[PDB]
Amino acid sequence: TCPFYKKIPGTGFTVDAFQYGVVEGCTAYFLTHFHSDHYAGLSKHFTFPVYCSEITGNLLKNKLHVQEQYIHPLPLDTECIVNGVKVVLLDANHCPGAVMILFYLPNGTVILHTGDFRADPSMERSLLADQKVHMLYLDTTYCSPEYTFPSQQEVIRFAINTAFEAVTLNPHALVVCGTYSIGKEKVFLAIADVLGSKVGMSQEKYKTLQCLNIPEINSLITTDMCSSLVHLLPMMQINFKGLQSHLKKCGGKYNQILAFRPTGWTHSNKFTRIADVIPQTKGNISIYGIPYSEHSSYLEMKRFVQWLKPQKIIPTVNVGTWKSRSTMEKYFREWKLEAGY
Length: 341
Ligand code: NI
Description:
The protein contains eight helices and 18 strands.
């Protein structure tokens, strides 16, 4: 049974609700992005209309095999009518293809569903500038003040400098980057660009990247592992055992691995600056955990919400405990009293 925070009142619409079977009254199923917790349930046998971005629709067709007749891609930043209701898709600053959805209800209420997002001041000059929002369905993944992390640009500066230094000292070092979903592609693309290399990967990962409309992608990636000195591997293999095993396979081409694990937040964020990050090392293998987030920090979230001034907030993450729900409600009330809405 579909929970309330996935239903859009006054419509036949749901958001990210494919794991509940046929939802009573649903005439259109929106999908915000191609992450498994949100697409859970979609397959080639699905026969209801799915509304999404172009990039998400490429992934549904090629990776999940959803038939073409049920995929409805919409352009961004464009007023569209769906089943008699005006909607707009906005860039969510999350992974490739990720959107927020603005719903203009027949009764005059305006609803914003963020999907998953990383709030940015540039969102204050989108189509959100133009009118009032009554209800906000909010990605509250990091809604607590302990959740701090640097800008994505600082994190990429750290990774590029770390990789370029290591490989210039040792031309026989290999760089490896972990992945388990779409998102965070700038980590491996920026490192391969500074090293003058394509990124090597499995056929399955190549296929996924080929769905993402990245400019000049054919110049940037390859399935020929041997020609490349930046390899992608599944996140589970990013440990001393998995990496040892990988170095064996390269036929004595390399004598050192430097590996990156992009995580979300970890408690080593509470004491250490990005500049001061050190790896875990065993012999000729070193592993860096780097805090590259595609979700809002607490401060970015608070700024967005204080600017938007919604009348009501419905959290979409951390909703399963009374303690989480109570904590989040307290911060919403602080924010509202501080800003005066
Ligand atoms: Ni996500």
